[PDB]
Each structure stands twice: as structure tokens, then as C-alpha cells.
């Protein structure tokens, strides 16, 4: 049976969460049976990135989807550009990979005020390396020893054998490329099935996304 689409989508539970995931353990939340008003989301805060792929950005208040997935994590400023299709680097290769045919939006903002501390916040981690690149929307939460050279590890950390996770360090005096950014990736599912997420019935065209 076709779904009820009357409630407003609970974007606040994602965007306003107290503590974000570490990027290697990025958190996914399914969004369904609700009305996504992107004009309201866009005006809810000052975002430094708000870019959509695989979809017309101005049509977002009129488009319908079978599901929306909201993926959230923290990275440093210089890495936000890697959250896009066809990028490479430590984040895109080993932590969070978007597909080439990505359908969704990437939303990010500077969280120096919340996520950095005098003396340094080490609470957020990233993965340093993997034997192979992540597939799109793959999550790796394992902690196997990575053989960085020609010495066999036999499961032991040591010479040329590295533990694969690493703390960021977030102090408010960091340069902006080393300051924390909270990221939300909205993935739009398009299965051949009844829509469960739609824009508002009486909607303005989502024009404000053009004038950043």
C-alpha cells in the first residue's frame, strides 16, 4: 500500500545531533514517509557547502523519492572537497566513497565552535590506509594490521605493521583547512516503487541554492 506523506522530515535529528560520527564509522539514518522542505533546511543554518549531484537542485521541493539516507561524520576542512563523485584521497579512498552516478546533496559546515578544544580534541578518527579502495557507500570498521612494507606482520603491530586508525586534532586556533567540518550526505533512492519522501505540496521553487 502507498505510504502516508504528511509529517515533516526529521532532519533536525541528523543535523542537530550532539556528537557526529567519526568518518571511518560514518553514521547512516534512513528518512522515509515524510515531506522534505529544502528551502527550510537550507535556511536552518549557514552552510559552507550545499551541492547536489544527479538531480536538478532547483526542483528539490517538487521531486519524490522512495527513500532518503542521511550520512553524517566529521572531517577537516581541506577534505570536504573529497566528498564528491570521482574524488581521491584518504577520505574518498579509505573512509567514505560516493559513486560516480551519485544522486543526492552534500551539505557541510564549519564546527570549530563545537568540535575543537583548547589543547586539542582527539575524539574524531579516520582510517589511514586499506589494501584496496572502498566501494561506494561501503563502511570499514575493522582494525586489522596493515602491512606497509615487506615484513610479514602475522597479526602483530610493529615495524612496518601499522594500526589503521588515527586521531584528528582539533584546536580552535587551527587554520581553517585543519578545523572540523560536520558533513551530511543526503542520498536519494530511486527504486521502481511508490515514493515515500516528497517536497511540499505548495512549494516555492528551491531557488536560493543557486545564490551561494
Amino acid at each position: 500500500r502507498f505510504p502516508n506523506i504528511t509529517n515533516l522530515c526529521p532532519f533536525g535529528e541528523v543535523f542537530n545531533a550532539t556528537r557526529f560520527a567519526s568518518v571511518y564509522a560514518w553514521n547512516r539514518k534512513r528518512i522515509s514517509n515524510c515531506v522534505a522542505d529544502y528551502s527550510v533546511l537550507y535556511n536552518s543554518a549557514s552552510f559552507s557547502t550545499f551541492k547536489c549531484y544527479g538531480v536538478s537542485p532547483t526542483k528539490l521541493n517538487d521531486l519524490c523519492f522512495t527513500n532518503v539516507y542521511a550520512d553524517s561524520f566529521v572531517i577537516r576542512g581541506d577534505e570536504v572537497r573529497q566528498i564528491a563523485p570521482g574524488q581521491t584521497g584518504k577520505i574518498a579512498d579509505y573512509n567514505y566513497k560516493l559513486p560516480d552516478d551519485f544522486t543526492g546533496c552534500v551539505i557541510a559546515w564549519n564546527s570549530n565552535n563545537l568540535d575543537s578544544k583548547v589543547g586539542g580534541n582527539y575524539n574524531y578518527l579516520y582510517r589511514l590506509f586499506r589494501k584496496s579502495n572502498l566501494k561506494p557507500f561501503e563502511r570499514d570498521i575493522s582494525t586489522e594490521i596493515y602491512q606497509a612494507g615487506s615484513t610479514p606482520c602475522n597479526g602483530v603491530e610493529g615495524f612496518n605493521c601499522y594500526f589503521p586508525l588515527q586521531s584528528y586534532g582539533f584546536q580552535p586556533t587551527n587554520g581553517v583547512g585543519y578545523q572540523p567540518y560536520r558533513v551530511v550526505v543526503l542520498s536519494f533512492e530511486l527504486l521502481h516503487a511508490p515514493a515515500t519522501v516528497c517536497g511540499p505540496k505548495k512549494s516555492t521553487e528551491f531557488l536560493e541554492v543557486l545564490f551561494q
Partner: nanobody, 118 residues
Framework: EVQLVESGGGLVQPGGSLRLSCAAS????????MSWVRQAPGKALEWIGS???????YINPSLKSLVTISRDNSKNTLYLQMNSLRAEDTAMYYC????????????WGQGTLVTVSS
């Protein structure tokens, strides 16, 4: 009822050690991570270290010289050992499952208070 219970914990002299423990209802609480986290008065939540499902550990790089984390799998119990404690180390100490998943995907213990002074 409560699924994550810290014990140990109480008064410590400056320069002393304390060992904390955390008993889990189930071993799935170590999938994928179990963490020790503390909160000092005045201060923000500070992650101390984690033990991952594999049995390996990663410690806050600014505290690694003072902290050890270990597990007893039969008892579903995680241990925190800290040495050379100072007044700064007075805090509520918590055991958190899947801390790296953020506040919407984690599971918190009740906490145990550790107080340092003369």
C-alpha cells in the same frame, strides 16, 4: 534494565593509579567498538581509548603514556588502567559502546566517579 555497568572507582591520591571495569550484558556490545570516555568538571567530553572487536586498542594520542585498556571475554568485561593521576583526572568515567558512530548510534553506561586529591 542496565546493560553496561562501570565499577571500580572512588578516591585516589595524586600520583596513584585506579583500575576501572565495565561489565556488558552481552558480547555484541564489543561489536564494533567499546570505549572509555570521561567528563571532568568544567570540561568537554573526552574520549580516552577504545577496544575494537578484534581485541586491538587505540588510545587518545595525548594520553597513551598513562592509559591501558584490556578485556576479559568470558566475563564480557573491559578494563581501564590509568597511572600517575592528577587533579585534572577527577571526572565521571563512562563506558560507551560504538562511540565512533556519534550520539545517535552509541550506547552509554551509567558512569563511575573518580576523585583525586590529598
Amino acid at each position: 534494565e542496565v546493560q553496561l555497568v562501570e565499577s571500580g572507582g572512588g578516591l585516589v591520591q595524586p600520583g596513584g593509579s585506579l583500575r576501572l571495569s565495565c561489565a556488558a550484558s552481552d558480547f555484541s556490545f564489543y561489536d564494533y567498538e567499546m570505549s572509555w570516555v570521561r567528563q571532568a568538571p568544567g570540561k568537554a567530553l573526552e574520549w580516552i581509548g577504545s577496544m575494537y572487536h578484534s581485541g586491538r586498542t587505540y588510545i587518545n594520542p595525548s594520553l597513551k603514556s598513562l592509559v591501558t585498556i584490556s578485556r576479559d571475554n568470558s566475563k564480557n568485561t573491559l578494563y581501564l588502567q590509568m597511572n600517575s593521576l592528577r587533579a585534572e583526572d577527577t571526572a565521571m568515567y563512562y563506558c560507551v559502546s560504538n562511540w565512533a558512530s556519534g550520539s545517535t548510534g552509541d550506547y552509554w553506561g551509567q558512569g563511575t566517579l573518580v576523585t583525586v586529591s590529598s
